[PDB]
Amino acid sequence: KVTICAQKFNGLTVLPPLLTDEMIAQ
Amino acid sequence: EILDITPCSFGGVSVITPGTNTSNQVAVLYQDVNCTEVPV
Numbered sequence: 001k002v003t004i005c006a007q008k009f010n011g012l013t014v015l016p017p018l019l020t021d022e023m024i025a026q
Numbered sequence: 027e028i029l030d031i032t033p034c035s036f037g038g039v040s041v042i043t044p045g046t047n048t049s050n051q052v053a054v055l056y057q058d059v060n061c062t063e064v065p066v
Contacts, residue, residue, distance in 0.1 A: 013037070
């Protein structure tokens with residue numbers, strides 16, 4: 001139920017978080 | 027004819043180091059890049 005672009009071209013980096021979605025479920 | 031223009035790749039460089047008191051052997055992370063074109 002919870003849902004600009006995937007790619008940005010001027011220094012806009014989204015970083016991957018350390019704790020993934022799987023082990024939070026663990 | 028339709029030409030998609032993309033700025034060619036960029037990304038920061040992460041440097042992983044231990045203590046310089048411990049060692050000088052270091053490792054490099056290239057972030058958000060599939061390392062098919064590493065050298066430049």
